[PDB]
Amino acid sequence: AALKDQLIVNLLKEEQVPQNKITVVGVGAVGMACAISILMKDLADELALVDVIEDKLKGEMMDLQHGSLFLKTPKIVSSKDYSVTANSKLVIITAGARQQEGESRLNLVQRNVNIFKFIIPNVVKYSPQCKLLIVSNPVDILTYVAWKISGFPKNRVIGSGCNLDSARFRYLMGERLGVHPLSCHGWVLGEHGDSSVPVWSGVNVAGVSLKSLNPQLGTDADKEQWKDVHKQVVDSAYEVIKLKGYTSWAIGLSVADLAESIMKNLRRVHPISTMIKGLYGIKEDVFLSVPCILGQNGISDVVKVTLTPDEEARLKKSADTLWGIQKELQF
Amino acid sequence: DQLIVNLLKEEQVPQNKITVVGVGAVGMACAISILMKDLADELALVDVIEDKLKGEMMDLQHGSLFLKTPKIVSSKDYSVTANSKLVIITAGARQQEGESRLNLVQRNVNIFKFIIPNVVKYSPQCKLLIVSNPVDILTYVAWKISGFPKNRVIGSGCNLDSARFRYLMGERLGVHPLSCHGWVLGEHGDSSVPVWSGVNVAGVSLKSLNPQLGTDADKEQWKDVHKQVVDSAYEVIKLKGYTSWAIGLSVADLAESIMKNLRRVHPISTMIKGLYGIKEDVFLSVPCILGQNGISDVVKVTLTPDEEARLKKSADTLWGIQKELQF
Amino acid sequence: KDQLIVNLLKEEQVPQNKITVVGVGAVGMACAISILMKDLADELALVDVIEDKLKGEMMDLQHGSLFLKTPKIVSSKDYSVTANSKLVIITAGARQQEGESRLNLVQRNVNIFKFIIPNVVKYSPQCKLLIVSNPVDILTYVAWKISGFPKNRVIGSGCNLDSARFRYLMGERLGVHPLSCHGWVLGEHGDSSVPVWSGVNVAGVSLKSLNPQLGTDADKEQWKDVHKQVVDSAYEVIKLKGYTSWAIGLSVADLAESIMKNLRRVHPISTMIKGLYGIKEDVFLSVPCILGQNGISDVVKVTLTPDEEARLKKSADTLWGIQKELQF
Amino acid sequence: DQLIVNLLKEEQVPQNKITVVGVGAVGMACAISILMKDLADELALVDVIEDKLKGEMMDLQHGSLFLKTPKIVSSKDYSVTANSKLVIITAGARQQEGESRLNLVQRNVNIFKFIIPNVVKYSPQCKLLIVSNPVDILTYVAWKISGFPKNRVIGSGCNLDSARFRYLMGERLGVHPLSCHGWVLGEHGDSSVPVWSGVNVAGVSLKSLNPQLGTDADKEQWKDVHKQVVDSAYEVIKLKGYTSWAIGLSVADLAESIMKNLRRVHPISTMIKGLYGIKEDVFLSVPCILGQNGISDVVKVTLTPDEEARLKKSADTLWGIQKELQF
């Protein structure tokens, strides 16, 4: 308009050329938790939202845009069309059918396959070089699904996996000791949720392992009953869902932590879900959480945790179960 | 005990504590924004619905690894709010269809006669920040019930209205809203006043370049920007059912000024008797200096006669409702 | 270690948000620490001709890595270390000596820039250039000429720190945070800068509308002394501590933030103003500029009084009178 | 006051104030790090050279627009430090060539007999963080002159040594130092102790994979990492003449745990009489829990016989000198 041209003289015709762009697919509670956390950590210069419900999608977009004065992310966009996501560095998948009472993982996954067969090829088309971060449950199997459909190399398809399980473990460990979770170390690996593995040998403060002071740590003979910390981790989502109906804030913060390592090329070590065929005795195409070095090319390296026979067996059983489900999937 | 050796029988007194009352979408957006900005060393949540409260508290605690707020607590018992520097009220009644204004406001008075005295009892020195709508009269109600001096009872007012104005302003100009200046004042919502004489970029008044700016003669109809602001909450509610994120960021911005004693200027709701021709105890949004004692100073905005009449009218409407309230 | 970490990907890292600082004097290291603590870069490169000092500064920054989010800090006298920078900040140059004319001082900076700038352009053809070396406005012209860059990608820090100082002093007078005190100092950085009194305001309330003599000798609040303090600032600080560093470092990192995050905020920085503001020469002067990922894309047009006009024109004449004598 | 109307007679007092004593390169690096981490609502600087002091203050004030610390003050008079939560001591004297270690400490005692009583008069409830070298003995000196309980007198100790270890470890492994764990304890400087048993990534002890880790038979020669840690300051001093940036960031990390009550674990200098077989009043670095009350708890590291003997030898040297100081 004329007033704008009285106020401002334009000296450059510029192109879009997005530079540090993140897409979040799905604007349910998880997706919007991821979105607000990413915004308040200044990780992106452009944020795109995608979902199939157009009213909801646009109203979330607008609500975020109205806070722009208080943010440092200049462009917030949304559309049901995936061209809005073009040139993302990182695309976060939180969409999918949510599990019904009594529904098996096989049935739920199969319900999601038709959804992912639409989303993933669309994401890959408009951002052929992006990293894919899968959050939708069940996380380990859906990361496999996204990997197979995308054709992406394994380093660029990542499941959020046990990142939050380990965060929950450290929160509860810290509450017990009276120390901040940042200084309380412990790793929950393997399958996300009920079959995860607390690696008791690695639980430590300031490099002092608890098991060195308490040889019964994590067993039924343990006088402090640290096995119940892992049980609380396993039961956390059910507990929160019972009180408030869903979880959102912690997974959103967890996912923004992963986004930070990717966008900033930090090469921090995260318990996240990666294709571990060839490692820990696994012989099939399976995604499980191990400590992964996460940076600008996704997962480039893994730490080799020394596992006991019991821990290794729990891992192999998960991989067998996972593979048993996956080979029954109709793509 | 074998791992950690205690050396100090110390007792924990909260130094920079904030309480949010109400854990609906508005209160939780305030909570998450306050946690992300590292403004409190303790966050307390209060609501009457005990399971939903506890579940929100737990969801936040599970993210502690990613935060710098080492204690997050909740309870329907207001003792958990003790020693808050700042208490943010988002609870209240929603209008029933066919219910009248005063009657809705009176129901809010009855609600606040429980909430405010419990807040005052455990944090006698806190600042009170009222976000519940309708904000201007409910700030008055909180002020009356609390007994606090006026500098320590604040309404969020037109803070979000102005941020929306600066967002829409920035879209027309291709400029970041941080560099687009404009002020919406008065009664939050439909009767608010955009002060066209102050709209500027880099100290260049837009009205000086477009003398009809804001009027019906405006060739670019910039009054539609203020209409978009007035309709904003309505459009978003229609689309997604409620608003949460923008009000949360806006309230965290006020909390930052208070907790860090910044003395930035915000368009917030304060008790303006004595100014802009107002004679009664009424709260309207003007530019306020916000710091560790609340609102200590106001910027005197030169208003046109039409603008001044609008402020006076909405002050009359507010006082008409307020003098019928039963405390 | 191969037993501990198993490599899964053969990767060649390309930095995506790299910044270079040229010159590791006090101004350069202040820009460096501020940029690191604002998490603006995924890689920081330092360049300087003093090899020992340069390496000691790099090591000292690297030892703080644990407390930072910038995973790679490198340095060399060789500009290959700067390859693929989004943003290159020049603080190096010559300092005037006893008996040396201004023209000769600037010419020594030209000859220095004739080594630095072509090396910067060799390794980062698409970078934005931010010139901090004094005399700022002339040397931004020198860098632009030598680089062959289009004007949107050569930025001089200009009056950014001057306006920040004005806003600090304004906030001290009023008891308001400088974030809420608005005023613009434009034109030439330093002695000949121009305070645009018409724009000084709080919350959109122009102080001149309340005080018609604002900024004049008849002003009873004597606001002219605020600008005089702005002009004298560097001199007072240099007299007391020997140099200035912290403030310019913070203001450069504020500029770096708008560029790296494509914010399109408005800053009083030095841009090639030929054909604008009544100016006819290829000269750099500070006006309110829209700063983003392509540099300066747009300029706000401040309405100037006749006095303000004449001062900007006079600065343009002064700058051009020097620039036309230079040997590139 | 046509522009601003005052509404409140406030006698403002600082709520989150930090003081830095000494504006040499270490002190100013501490200051800029603390300003940029938004840790304080007021920052005070103190030193004996008035021109240098005022100029550093002015240089910081001129960046206020880019900060969130609304008051920055300085003086040589300690009244400017009143009501500090935390006071950081970086001032002192450097060992001249041919000067005995005992004489150097005593010269620092004499300076501290002026500094510490003035700090304590104006901030009787502060935590004291001693950065001046040699840190371990000077934390003792400040403790004795202040009369403070041990929890409130903290030496920066081995915090930076461990950060350098983790930097060098991360460089060897291709991993960010945040994910590389290792602890350097004891006396800051040539005699520090690297606790090889705690060195790990993701809870995987490197010693479990390499039993010779840190010994002369170590095929990867990790002992050279701790030698680099010990030689670091000397190398950087040789190249640029002093060190500043890293110690500044390290101090601001400790200030963060104090100001925000984080209760993180840091390898810092604390009175450890009663632990590790030590029977005198000496300060050494062990893993401490750091919060709003200073050092409240300590992690009990299992030390091998060699490691226990290094720590006890440092204790003996420390006490040997401390025994001979004139207070």
Numbering used by the authors:
A (entry chain C): 1 to 331
B (entry chain B), D (entry chain D): 5 to 331
C (entry chain A): 4 to 331
How does the study describe this entry?
LDHA (also known as LDH-M and LDH-5) is a homotetrameric enzyme that catalyzes the cytosolic conversion of pyruvate to lactate in the final step of glycolysis, oxidizing nicotinamide adenine dinucleotide (NADH) in the process. Elevated LDHA levels are integrally associated with many cancer types and it appears likely to be a principal factor in the altered metabolisms required for the growth and proliferation of certain tumors. These observations have highlighted LDHA as an attractive target for new anti-cancer agents for use against glycolytic tumors. Considering extremely high sequence identity between the human and rat LDHA sequences (94% identity), the fact that the cofactor and substrate binding sites are identical, and recent structural work from the literature with the rat homologue, we developed a very efficient, automated purification protocol for the production of milligram quantities of very pure, untagged rat LDHA (rLDHA), as an alternative to the human protein, from E. coli, using the ÄKTAxpress™ chromatography system.
We next embarked on development of a robust protein crystallisation rationale for use in soaking and co-crystallisation of fragments and small molecules for development of inhibitors for LDHA. Upon close inspection both tetramers appeared in a ‘fully open’ conformation (all subunits in the tetramer adopting an open conformation with respect to the active site loop) despite the presence of electron density in the lactate binding site. The electron density was attributed to the presence of oxamate in the crystallization conditions. Oxamate was therefore modelled in to the density present in each of the 8 subunits in the assymetric unit. Of note, to our knowledge this is the first example of an LDH crystal structure where oxamate (or lactate or oxalate) is bound without the presence of a co-factor (NAD/NADH) or co-factor mimic. In the T. maritima structure, the open conformation is caused by a Cd2+ ion binding in the active site and stopping the loop from closing. These conformational state changes are important to charcaterise as they present very different molecular contacts surfaces for the binding of small molecules and fragments. The molecular mass average across the elution profile is 141.4 ± 3.7 kDa. with excellent mono-dispersity (Mw/Mn = 1.001). This is in excellent agreement with theoretical molecular weight of 145.6 kDa. for tetrameric rLDHA (monomer = 36.4 kDa.). All of these data illustrate the very high quality of the purified protein and the robustness of the methodology for the production of very pure, mono-disperse, tetrameric rLDHA. We acknowledge Diamond Light Source for time on I04 under proposal.
